[PDB]
């Protein structure tokens, strides 16, 4: 059993919309720090404060505090505000105290759980820089070539100081997910002032630009990609207890054989508004179901050739997402319609995958009948499209 350590009202800055929203927050001794639209009447690692760095600031609002987290390879920040500096002090103190208690118990246990783990490869010059893939608040993602092997990777280069809080996340390659369609970490190293993550880069091209070229995917082809995405998100949800939050078509790549890769290239933005779930827009509470919304948008895009909700004006886009009922092309069939309307329920509690069953609900949906999920996981499904690359070093889809 987990104990509420401290609870109360806080103003929370929106993570996409940047208004201030009063929310009722519980800090628990397992490290969870979670906000609610109302004091709940009765656990995702996304909400953990363990391993955080705590900042006190006075901009844009007085008495604000920032929790900053490295989650896998991405820096995440949550910003809060209270009325009085005395209140801020009690909150930051409770948060620190909970975390310290987590560190102190982890290290005692692992100190005894040590079995010739008491033993004592790569640097920047090993790599050729090729292409900026993204920039963000605290770093950048670049396409590199490993000079010794000719192999291509994405390298994520982050400012060491925003992550580490006077001490110091290097054996992370040992915590790799055992899932084929997630992006695996190959190396992680640090420089004097940077922390670098070298991760796989699929060379079968961007699904965004395969879909653009082809206009639409058949229901069978979208079934294939959807099944692979579902397998990966099921793994994240149930083996890692984390939500992705970032499912969009541009984050989907194909490997040389045609299997999905979900990318891990996100950097801090302190946008793609068309993929945001309604509860994320309203900064209501969110959990595993936000990923099933994204699945719904991505597969609507695959089978219909356009977004379920779009407007060039972001404000009417948000209203469409929040308010408008989904329309389908007339040539779409009823198993696809049922899946998509279920994944795009606006109420996360009514959405397919939004119950205790999580991904099993989707896995059991009519649209996926006949899919052998063990074969999906094992890459025994035969891809409907093989990209035009010779080996894992044919740069067809970059150059």
């Amino acid at each position: 059993d987990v104990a509420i350590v401290k609870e109360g009202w806080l103003h929370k800055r929106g993570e996409y919309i940047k208004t201030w929203r009063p929310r009722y927050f519980l800090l628990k001794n397992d490290g969870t720090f979670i906000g609610y639209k109302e004091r709940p009447q009765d656990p995702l690692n996304n909400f953990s404060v363990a391993q955080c760095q705590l900042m006190k600031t006075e901009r844009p609002r007085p008495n604000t505090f920032i929790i900053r987290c490295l989650q896998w390879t991405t820096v995440i920040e949550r910003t809060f505000h209270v009325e009085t500096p005395e209140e801020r002090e009690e909150w930051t103190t409770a948060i620190q105290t909970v975390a310290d208690g987590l560190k102190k118990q982890e290290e005692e246990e692992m100190d005894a759980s040590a079995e010739h783990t008491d033993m004592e490869r790569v640097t920047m010059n090993e790599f050729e820089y090729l292409k900026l893939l993204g920039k963000g608040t605290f770093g950048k993602v670049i396409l590199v070539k490993e000079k010794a092997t000719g192999r291509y990777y994405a390298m994520k280069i982050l400012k060491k100081e925003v992550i580490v809080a006077k001490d110091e996340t290097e054996n992370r390659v040992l915590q790799n997910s055992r899932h084929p369609f997630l992006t695996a970490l190959k190396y992680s190293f640090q420089t004097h002032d940077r922390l670098c993550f070298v991760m796989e880069y699929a060379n079968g091209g961007e699904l965004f630009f395969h879909l653009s070229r082809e206009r639409v995917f058949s229901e069978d082809r979208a079934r294939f990609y959807g099944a692979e995405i579902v397998s990966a998100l099921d793994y994240l949800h149930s083996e890692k207890n984390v939500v992705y939050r970032d499912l969009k078509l541009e984050n989907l790549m194909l490997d040389k054989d045609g299997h999905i890769k979900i990318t891990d290239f996100g950097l801090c933005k302190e946008g793609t508004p068309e993929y945001l779930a309604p509860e994320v827009l309203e900064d209501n509470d969110y959990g595993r179901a936000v990923d099933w919304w994204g699945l719904g948008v991505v597969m609507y895009e695959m089978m219909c050739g356009r977004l379920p909700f779009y407007n060039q004006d972001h404000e009417k886009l948000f209203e469409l997402i929040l308010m408008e009922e989904i329309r389908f092309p007339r040539t779409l069939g009823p198993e696809a319609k049922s899946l998509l309307s279920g994944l795009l329920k606006k109420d996360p509690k009514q959405r397919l995958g939004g119950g205790s069953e999580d991904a099993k609900e989707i896995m059991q949906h009519r649209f996926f009948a006949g899919i052998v999920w063990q074969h999906v996981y094992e890459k025994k499904l035969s891809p409907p499209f093989k990209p035009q690359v010779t080996s894992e070093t044919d740069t067809r889809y970059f150059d």
């Epitope: 290290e107 005692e108 692992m110 100190d111 005894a112 040590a114 079995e115 008491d118 054996n171």
Partner: nanobody, 115 residues
Framework: QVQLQESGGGLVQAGGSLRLSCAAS????????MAWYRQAPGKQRELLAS???????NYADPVKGRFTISRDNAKNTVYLQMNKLIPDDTAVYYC??????????WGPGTQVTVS
């Protein structure tokens, strides 16, 4: 002052013997896998011996039979007993727990030179 402290070093003649002692101040060696290390003027730091919480011991090849790792829970101290010493054993010796090891935290070490 939470810290690990090594002593017992000095000059020894090859084929000699020495007992190194690691005095823990603010830590409990009972609850922690303890280990011994050494580092020579150009080499990497070397895992030498570890004593599990159970008392199980294990050694790296260059040392088995010759050195013995021992925990003494009553004194909160660990020991390296070094016998049949070799010039290639000359180095600075450290003792550590798992947590301090991965955070690169070290006591002062003790120098052992043999020829």
């Amino acid at each position: 002052q939470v810290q690990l402290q090594e002593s017992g070093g000095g000059l020894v003649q090859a084929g000699g013997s020495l007992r190194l002692s690691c005095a823990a101040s603010g830590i409990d060696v009972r609850i922690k896998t303890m280990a011994w290390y050494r580092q020579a003027p150009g080499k990497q730091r070397e895992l030498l011996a570890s004593v599990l919480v159970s008392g199980s011991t294990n050694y790296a090849d260059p040392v088995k039979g010759r050195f013995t790792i021992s925990r003494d829970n009553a004194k909160n101290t660990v020991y390296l007993q070094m016998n049949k010493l070799i010039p290639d054993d000359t180095a600075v010796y450290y003792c550590n727990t798992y947590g301090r090891l991965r955070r690169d935290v070290w006591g002062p070490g003790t120098q052992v030179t043999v020829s």
